[PDB]
Amino acid sequence: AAFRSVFPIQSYSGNSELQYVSYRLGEPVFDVQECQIRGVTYSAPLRVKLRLVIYEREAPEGTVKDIKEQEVYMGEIPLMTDNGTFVINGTERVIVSQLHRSPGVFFDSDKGKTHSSGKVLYNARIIPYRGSWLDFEFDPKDNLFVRID
Amino acid sequence: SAAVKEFFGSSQLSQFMDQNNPLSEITHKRRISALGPGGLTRERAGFEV
Amino acid sequence: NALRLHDEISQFTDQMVMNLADWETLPYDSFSPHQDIISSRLSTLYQLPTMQRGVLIVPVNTLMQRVCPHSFLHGHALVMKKGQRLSRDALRTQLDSAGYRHVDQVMEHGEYATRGALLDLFPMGSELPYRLDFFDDEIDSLRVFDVDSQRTLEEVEAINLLPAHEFPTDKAAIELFRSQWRDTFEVKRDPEHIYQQVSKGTLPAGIEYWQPLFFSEPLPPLFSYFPANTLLVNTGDLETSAERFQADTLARFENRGVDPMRPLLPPQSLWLRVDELFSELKNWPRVQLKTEHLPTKAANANLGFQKLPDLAVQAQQKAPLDALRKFLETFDGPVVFSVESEGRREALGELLARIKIAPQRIMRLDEASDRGRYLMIGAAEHGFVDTVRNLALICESDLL
Amino acid sequence: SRARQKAAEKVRDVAAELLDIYAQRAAKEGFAFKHDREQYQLFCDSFPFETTPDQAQAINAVLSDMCQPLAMDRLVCGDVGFGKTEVAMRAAFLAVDNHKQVAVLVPTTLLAQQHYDNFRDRFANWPVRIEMISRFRSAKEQTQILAEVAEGKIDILIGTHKLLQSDVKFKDLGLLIVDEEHRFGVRHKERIKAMRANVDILTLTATPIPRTLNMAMSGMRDLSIIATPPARRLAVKTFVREYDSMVVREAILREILRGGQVYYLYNDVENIQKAAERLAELVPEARIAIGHGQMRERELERVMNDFHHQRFNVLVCTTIIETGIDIPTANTIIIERADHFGLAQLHQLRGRVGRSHHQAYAWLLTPHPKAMTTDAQKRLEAIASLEDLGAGFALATHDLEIRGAGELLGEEQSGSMETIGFSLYMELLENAVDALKAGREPSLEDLTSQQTEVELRMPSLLPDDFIPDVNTRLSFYKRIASAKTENELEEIKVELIDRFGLLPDPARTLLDIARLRQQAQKLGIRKLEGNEKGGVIEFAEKNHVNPAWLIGLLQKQPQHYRLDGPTRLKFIQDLSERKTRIEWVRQFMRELEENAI
DNA sequence: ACCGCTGCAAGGAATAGGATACTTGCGGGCTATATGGCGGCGAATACCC
DNA sequence: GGGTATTCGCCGCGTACCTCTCCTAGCCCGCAAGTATCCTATTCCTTGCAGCGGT
RNA sequence: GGAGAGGUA
Ligand SMILES: Nc1ncnc2c1ncn2[C@@H]1O[C@H](COP(=O)(O)OP(=O)(O)OP(=O)(O)O)[C@@H](O)[C@H]1O
Numbered sequence A: 001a002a003f004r005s006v007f008p009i010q011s012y013s014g015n016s017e018l019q020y021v022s023y024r025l026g027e028p029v030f031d032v033q034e035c036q037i038r039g040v041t042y043s044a045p046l047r048v049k050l051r052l053v054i055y056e057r058e059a060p061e062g063t064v065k066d067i068k069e070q071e072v073y074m075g076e077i078p079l080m081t082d083n084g085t086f087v088i089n090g091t092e093r094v095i096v097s098q099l100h101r102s103p104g105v106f107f108d109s110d111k112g113k114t115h116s117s118g119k120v121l122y123n124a125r126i127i128p129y130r131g132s133w134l135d136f137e138f139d140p141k142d143n144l145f146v147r148i149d
Numbered sequence B: 001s002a003a004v005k006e007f008f009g010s011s012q013l014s015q016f017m018d019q020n021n022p023l024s025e026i027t028h029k030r031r032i033s034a035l036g037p038g039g040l041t042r043e044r045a046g047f048e049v
Numbered sequence C: 001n002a003l004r005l006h007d008e009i010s011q012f013t014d015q016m017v018m019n020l021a022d023w024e025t026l027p028y029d030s031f032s033p034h035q036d037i038i039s040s041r042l043s044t045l046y047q048l049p050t051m052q053r054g055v056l057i058v059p060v061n062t063l064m065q066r067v068c069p070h071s072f073l074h075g076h077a078l079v080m081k082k083g084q085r086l087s088r089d090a091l092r093t094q095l096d097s098a099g100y101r102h103v104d105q106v107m108e109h110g111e112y113a114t115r116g117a118l119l120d121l122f123p124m125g126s127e128l129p130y131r132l133d134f135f136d137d138e139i140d141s142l143r144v145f146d147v148d149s150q151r152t153l154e155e156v157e158a159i160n161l162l163p164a165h166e167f168p169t170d171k172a173a174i175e176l177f178r179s180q181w182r183d184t185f186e187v188k189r190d191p192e193h194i195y196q197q198v199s200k201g202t203l204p205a206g207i208e209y210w211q212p213l214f215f216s217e218p219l220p221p222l223f224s225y226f227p228a229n230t231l232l233v234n235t236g237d238l239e240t241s242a243e244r245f246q247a248d249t250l251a252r253f254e255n256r257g258v259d260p261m262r263p264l265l266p267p268q269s270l271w272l273r274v275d276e277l278f279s280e281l282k283n284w285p286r287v288q289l290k291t292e293h294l295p296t297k298a299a300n301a302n303l304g305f306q307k308l309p310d311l312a313v314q315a316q317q318k319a320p321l322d323a324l325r326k327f328l329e330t331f332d333g334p335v336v337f338s339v340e341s342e343g344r345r346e347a348l349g350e351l352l353a354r355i356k357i358a359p360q361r362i363m364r365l366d367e368a369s370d371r372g373r374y375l376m377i378g379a380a381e382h383g384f385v386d387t388v389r390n391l392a393l394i395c396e397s398d399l400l
Numbered sequence D: 001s002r003a004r005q006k007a008a009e010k011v012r013d014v015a016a017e018l019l020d021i022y023a024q025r026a027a028k029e030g031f032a033f034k035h036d037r038e039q040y041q042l043f044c045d046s047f048p049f050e051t052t053p054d055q056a057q058a059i060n061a062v063l064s065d066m067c068q069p070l071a072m073d074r075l076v077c078g079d080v081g082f083g084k085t086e087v088a089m090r091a092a093f094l095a096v097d098n099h100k101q102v103a104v105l106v107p108t109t110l111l112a113q114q115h116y117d118n119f120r121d122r123f124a125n126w127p128v129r130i131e132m133i134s135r136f137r138s139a140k141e142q143t144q145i146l147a148e149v150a151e152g153k154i155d156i157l158i159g160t161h162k163l164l165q166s167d168v169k170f171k172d173l174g175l176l177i178v179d180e181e182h183r184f185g186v187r188h189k190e191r192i193k194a195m196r197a198n199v200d201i202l203t204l205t206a207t208p209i210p211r212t213l214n215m216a217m218s219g220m221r222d223l224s225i226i227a228t229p230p231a232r233r234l235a236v237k238t239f240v241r242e243y244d245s246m247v248v249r250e251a252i253l254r255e256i257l258r259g260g261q262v263y264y265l266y267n268d269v270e271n272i273q274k275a276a277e278r279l280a281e282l283v284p285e286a287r288i289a290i291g292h293g294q295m296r297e298r299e300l301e302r303v304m305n306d307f308h309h310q311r312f313n314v315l316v317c318t319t320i321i322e323t324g325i326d327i328p329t330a331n332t333i334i335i336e337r338a339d340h341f342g343l344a345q346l347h348q349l350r351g352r353v354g355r356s357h358h359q360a361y362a363w364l365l366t367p368h369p370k371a372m373t374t375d376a377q378k379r380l381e382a383i384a385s386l387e388d389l390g391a392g393f394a395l396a397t398h399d400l401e402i403r404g405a406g407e408l409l410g411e412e413q414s415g416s417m418e419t420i421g422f423s424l425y426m427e428l429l430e431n432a433v434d435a436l437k438a439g440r441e442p443s444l445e446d447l448t449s450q451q452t453e454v455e456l457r458m459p460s461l462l463p464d465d466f467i468p469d470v471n472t473r474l475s476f477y478k479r480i481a482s483a484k485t486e487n488e489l490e491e492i493k494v495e496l497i498d499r500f501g502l503l504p505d506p507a508r509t510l511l512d513i514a515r516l517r518q519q520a521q522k523l524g525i526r527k528l529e530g531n532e533k534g535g536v537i538e539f540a541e542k543n544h545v546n547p548a549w550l551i552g553l554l555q556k557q558p559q560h561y562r563l564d565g566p567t568r569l570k571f572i573q574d575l576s577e578r579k580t581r582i583e584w585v586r587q588f589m590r591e592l593e594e595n596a597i
Numbered sequence E: 001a002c003c004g005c006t007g008c009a010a011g012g013a014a015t016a017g018g019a020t021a022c023t024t025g026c027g028g029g030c031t032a033t034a035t036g037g038c039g040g041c042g043a044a045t046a047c048c049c
Numbered sequence F: 001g002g003g004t005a006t007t008c009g010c011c012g013c014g015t016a017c018c019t020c021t022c023c024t025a026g027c028c029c030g031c032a033a034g035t036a037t038c039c040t041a042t043t044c045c046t047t048g049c050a051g052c053g054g055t
Numbered sequence G: 001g002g003a004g005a006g007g008u009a
């Protein structure tokens, strides 16, 4: 999902771009208890089949001089052990689940405890998963207002 | 490697295993924390949440 | 090639050699051609109607370019030197046509004085009044005299009232340019648009290419500027180069045949065509120089102007100067070497003296004797033998 | 992946030598040159322009200084195209009619052969010989010009680093001119002042290094700024565009339709020949040739002459023309990738266009504006904001304090790196001066010539932590080099043992280099070099080497002795350990003086 | 009977790489802005007359 | 201008103890680019003698 | 020394 989000990456000039084929986790260099003793991550190397095109310059937009492909490594990702723990530095750590605001749109009202009036002020948040929030609210004098972030 | 190692190594919800039982670890892997990034905090939480 | 000829002929004569400083800007550009060069440009066009001799070098693009309609040149220009045989009331009525007011104590623009023998003027261009003191249908003084104190700062030989641009910049010309815009082009609401820019009066970069809209008259092909007895001298070729440039102009025109921001005049309006160019070319007698043999007819003369032999130096041979050392021995005529630079002369001066050759620097090619080694300092590029009179030039490039 | 990083080398220390040369210079009186009003007035008649008063201000600042007995080291830095050369020629002329061997150093060949023409056109009426040395001169030519240097038949010599091969013993220097001084490091600058301390120095650039700018602001060296551009030269319209062949093609057509010539910067010697043909289909109408520092050292002669004789429009080129070649016909630079260039380099690149009445366009081809790095960006609007005639010293001052001037008594002329105090520089210099003038002891470099070549590729010196006092470090160096007995080497040894405790490795190796130097001079050994693969010894004409036992060595170990020349003996030994190498030469020369005769 | 002529040995000159310097920039290796508090109080405007 | 009303911004928000892990960019060294120098090496002009043919 | 998390009363 993340690689199809980001890749393919174009260039600014647009004479070439880097695309993605597949990924494959390497075999861990140590297993769980040896990583536990030594004091190091229980980690898998990530080996990705990246693919770079080359277009032709004088030829118009979309032509191919050449294209190359290889398995290239990026980053050690820790693997979860057989139970649910991550061995990160010889200390077994657990990533506890979070319980957060589901992105969407949420209507709400501060129940009449503002503006010294007893008038309720409905508001609406557009909560993105990743991006800038959006707020609408009523003035006490019935004016619709917006604010970003 | 930095953006993985920081989160798995030292994050706000990457916590140390309570491992003085079987029960303690199995109730720690099932924990539902409302804290963290994108969530509330311990001293700024009302009576209602 | 013009540049080359400009100092080639400067090597080979004494006569006044001068170019046409054309727009260094490209046809339908978006730039300015550096105003002062234009101030040099029109000066040439002031003298093109009246010189009795003189060498003017123009390339084909200049002849392709159109010009000002010359009534502006006679009207808004007071470039005037000491040899301007002109009376008193003639400048009176000419500056009346320019619109000047008669004040004997000139303080304001558009003013002049004319009493007895003295003429003064205060221009529309600068902040300086000028005493003229015309004598017997001629001019004799150019006194930079004070605006109030009437005392001369400097006596000048030639006054230079050239307005800053090709076109008149006055508001009537602005309205005329607006009128011709609404005639040919269209008006759109944009502050950056040049129609509204000249409505604000400002002068954009490529303003010269919307030239004729400032005159409401067709631009001359500049040959009306010509004297009666010029002589056209073909150099290179015409029936390729002119058409080639015509192709370049139309290519740029249709290339920038877009953008209602700065729409562009048809090139027939702002330029000749090759057809009408060759139509005006039969109005003047012409000399066509080609490096080939014309066989035989009247008004041809083939001049024996043969190429030099294999003249080259090399350190591979035991004595490097063999070609010259044997070519001079078999040589009957004078030999002029024509070194380019002065110290380069001694670059040959310690070089031919190695083979006991001491060529003396002369000035005029007519000074050549029957048998002698002489040299010039100039801008030749390739030597040749004048077998008509056994003359010879052996340039620098004849040695490398 | 073949980077192979993390090495270390500190084979020489520089602060001692620079203190020595400055203390030698301040000690020796300079030369009150003689001025001629009238014979130099006829030389003034020769110059076919009229001076700006700022050029004249530079001229009389130079002349009234150089006719004095003090130390003249003047910055005549102005901006590009401001006639900076002719003031240098005027100083040279006035010096050379005192017959005082003006030396001129340029950071390239190209300046030397153009300035050869420039000077030679200038001095066409005077009995003065002007010569140029380079790799373009034949070696046979080099041998005899360096000879007539020693007889002083050449009065004016210009050259590359080929002049600073240190075998060039001049007859009588009185003036040094450095053109485009912003090269050379420091060593190549002060190598010539080493041999002559009391010589006069004229320093020309357009963009100085920050180090000499700071030292100009220190009062140590004089400054003449030049403003007032001499002519109808405008300002090269800087254009910073993302790379587009259409923009390129219209620029080239603009220049060729103007008839002028094209500078095309590529700065990539491998790929520039491909750059030629890919430019060739883009502009088939042009005339293009290829120029860089890697033809067969004769092609570029044709190329430069043909370009100067307008035989082709476009020159694709590297930074070998960054030095300031005039050729006033061209007016268009195409900088293909301006990103990897310093601002001084950029001002130079703008510097070669213009030089004339004609307007010169400049084209700064860059990558995409986000794609350009922020260093390259802020450099680009730095050069774009400041396009003004006479803006060079402003740009040089901006270069300063952004990079920081290098240390005042060492190399690496740009970079802050926490230098020593300028007041400390004064105090250390004067202490060096009066301590040196005390007993009038000969210099370092004087005892390099008398000393036999005893370089053994060793880090062997007095390190900074061992003695931070550079002044008495130089004093110890002078005493050590002056030592003519091994016993006084020994009292120097116990002296430093007393004064600073334990002796480090470079110091004790310096001691034993002096030891072997002693017996090398004593027997007559003249040149003794060593390395990993062995080393080579050169004797005298009167050696204390046994010839019969020398042949005996050659036939007991042909793998370890080869006479290749009269006294030129190569030994081949796998000399990996430096201490065993020291004892190798030590014990060997001990057996050799056992065979002393 | 040898003179004249070309072919290869020789021999050097050059030129072609390989190292040694000097300048800029860059990268790595160490090593020297996030959005979920609330109430109180008081100063500082908003508006209205 | 003056008077009241709304609005913004700062002030606070329990004590004591125990356990654990984790706290970085920069800079300058050496690569790239360029420029110049110094070599061996091998290639390349160049010529003399050796020998082979001709009247 | 400072953050981050968890814990006891
Ligand atoms: N007094 C003057 N008046 C008009 N033009 C001048 C004058 N002095 C020099 N020039 C022109 O300006 C040009 C400057 O070129 P030159 O190399 O001689 O000095 P420079 O360019 O300042 O030095 P550098 O090449 O180191 O920048 C000269 O070629 C000369 O033609």
Ligand SMILES: [Mg+2]
Pocket (backbone or CB within 6 Å): G009
């Ligand atoms: Mg309790």
